C-alpha cells in the first residue's frame with residue numbers, strides 16, 4: 001500500500017497474540033511497544049528521544065505482523081505513550097519513503 | 100527519490116540560508132530542529148516525546164528545502180536529540196510510506 005502522511009501513520013500489528021495500533025515510524029531505529037507482559041528472556045536498555053531517556057525491556061526474535069506483512073525481530077517494551085514500529089521491522093516489510 | 104530504511108533516512112536541508120542534516124521522521128507530527136537562530140517572531144511552545152516534554156520556539160511559515168524539494172511551514176527549535184523533519188513538511192514535499 002501507499003500511506004500518506006496527512007495523519008499519523010497508524011496501522012494494525014499483531015504481537016504475542018494481541019492486535020495493537022502502532023505508528024510506522026521512520027525516525028525510530030528500534031520498535032518500542034507500550035507496556036505488555038511478554039514471555040521470555042529480556043535485557044535492560046535505555047533509549048532516548050525528545051524529553052530524555054526511558055527504560056525498556058529488550059526482547060529478541062519476537063514475531064510481529066504489520067498490516068498482514070510478517071516480521072520477526074527485537075521489540076523494546078516500556079512506558080512509551082504510543083506503539084512505535086521502527087526501522088528494524090519496517091525494512092522487513094519492504095517499507096520505503098518516496099517523494 | 101525512494102529511500103529504504105536499513106540506514107537512518109538522513110537528508111540535507113537548507114534553512115535560513117544554512118545547510119543541515121535532518122531525519123525524515125514519520126513518527127513526528129512537527130518538524131523540530133536543534134537550537135539555532137531563525138529570523139522573525141517566535142512563540143514559546145511545549146512538545147512531548149518518548150522521554151517527556153521540552154520547551155521549543157515555534158517559527159511559522161519558514162522556507163525549508165528538503166533534498167531539493169521546497170516546503171514552507173512551521174519549524175520548532177529546541178533541544179531535540181537530532182534534527183527531525185516531521186509530517187507537517189513531509190506532506191508538503193509529497194512524501195509517502197510505501198510497502
Ligand SMILES: CC[C@H](C)CN(C[C@@H](O)[C@H](Cc1ccccc1)NC(=O)OC[C@@H]1CCC(=O)N1)S(=O)(=O)c1ccc2ncsc2c1
Nearest residue numbers: 027028029030047048049050082126127128147148149180
Ligand atoms: C531521535 C529521533 C526521534 C525523536 C526518535 N523518536 C521517534 C519519533 O518518531 C517520535 C515517536 C513518538 C511518537 C509519539 C510519542 C512519543 C514518541 N516522535 C516524536 O518525538 O515527536 C514529538 C511529538 C510526539 C508525537 C508527535 O507527533 N510529536 S523516539 O524517541 O520515539 C525513539 C524511537 C525508537 C528508538 N529506538 C532507539 S532510540 C529510539 C527513539
